[PDB]
Design a protein around this ligand. Sequence first.
Ligand SMILES: *Cc1c(COP(=O)(O)O)cnc(C)c1O
Ligand SMILES: [Cl-]
Ligand code: NA
Ligand code: NA
Ligand code: NA
Length: 496
Amino acid sequence: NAMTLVYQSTRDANNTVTASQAILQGLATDGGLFTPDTYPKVDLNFDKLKDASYQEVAKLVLSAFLDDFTVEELDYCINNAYDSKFDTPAIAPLVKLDGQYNLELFHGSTIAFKDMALSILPYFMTTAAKKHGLENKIVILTATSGDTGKAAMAGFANVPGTEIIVFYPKDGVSKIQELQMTTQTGDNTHVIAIDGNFDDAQTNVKHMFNDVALREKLTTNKLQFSSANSMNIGRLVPQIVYYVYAYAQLVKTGEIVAGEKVNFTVPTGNFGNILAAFYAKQIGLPVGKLICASNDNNVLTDFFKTRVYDKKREFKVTTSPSMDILVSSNLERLIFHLLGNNAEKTTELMNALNTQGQYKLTDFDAEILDLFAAEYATEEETAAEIKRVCELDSYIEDPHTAVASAVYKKYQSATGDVTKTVIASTASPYKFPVVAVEAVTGKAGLTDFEALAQLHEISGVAVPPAVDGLEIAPIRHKTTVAAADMQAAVEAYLGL
Ligand SMILES: *Cc1c(COP(=O)(O)O)cnc(C)c1O
Ligand SMILES: [Cl-]
Ligand code: NA
Ligand code: NA
Ligand code: NA
């Protein structure tokens, strides 16, 4: 068959593109997300996959979803992504604990799961540009206060045919977060601290992406913008791979036989990680339940329990900051599927979220919604969970992982479900060491660097390269600009 998988915008039934086009374009001009309109046929033979390398599972899954790329293009992307940047050749090892399995997604460059897709996105982009006969360098603009900034920089660093400029809020990040970015190496990477309202920074990036005069200047200088934000399909599809890999590891170790259903509990922010597990189920992965774990910012928990998405609520900075959200960006893709892949109806709900601050899901596919469960954990519950898993399993979870393991305990209690369950472990405790060390030791008032040293003494786990010697690493980025000067600084840097 010569058919390719059609990606459509969730807000325009006529905006259809191939996988390579969706990745290079990133954002749909209509405001929607590029989303697969059908699910590809994938032969999940665990008799073979139980012995497959991570890269072999990636080739099977990525071939199915990114089907306008050749086998040789995908091999190039997989081999360049899943290399020595990872601190174990397993890439995403599954660890067996007393009452759960933890899928460790923190073995990449920045010890956080966003490395899984950001290690490969740059190669998808440069390969897509060449496939479309473009001779332009791709310029990524990223405005974020989360771990995405460091993961994006580390993924694009020294990738030929790419340049990345990351904007972060000055005094809006921890000292350990700031140093991770300002010590980042790579001549094609630049990090700029923004003085002022950081909402303006995000607005200014969108303005630049839609600026027709600026686009003409980039074209003339053999440049083009792309986006590596939460809604790029190239950041979601590589996440499908590790759900299939986790299942393969359960079969390989004799924990399950192929065909048995497993559950996945996912610490959720913008929803792409748990949506990737949903896409894994759609291509045949035996999934019993997808458990959406939230922190005190529980708009998603309220949505799954009432079908009302209401963003008019207090916002809290928590100990699981990557999940501090009001608008879960990728939930829109699930809304689209819940409505039978209907862009008009999806647009209506998204327009209601913007004008009314809320929407209610009605006339949806119950088979899809019934796959999801949801609970949230408080900050105290997060700390109590890091302490309990340390006591029971001699294993230290980061706070995001602990929100998920605490939510799994709540899910088990409320439903009595005994299905084997995998926790998606989204960061190393070395990335958020203060809450982890204080939770297991009872200590208080530790600095980030004091907690790093104590975590090594307590766990016996080697300090990952991302935070090893970070206190004395050379500062390569020392730029702070006002939000209103971002575009002039970008134009001057690009020689426009
Ligand atoms: C980004 C992030 C999350 C949330 O992931 P989504 O796919 O956006 O739901 C959770 N934990 C950590 C550590 C993260 O960096
Ligand atoms: Cl610069
Ligand atoms: Na590389
Ligand atoms: Na069993
Ligand atoms: Na299948």
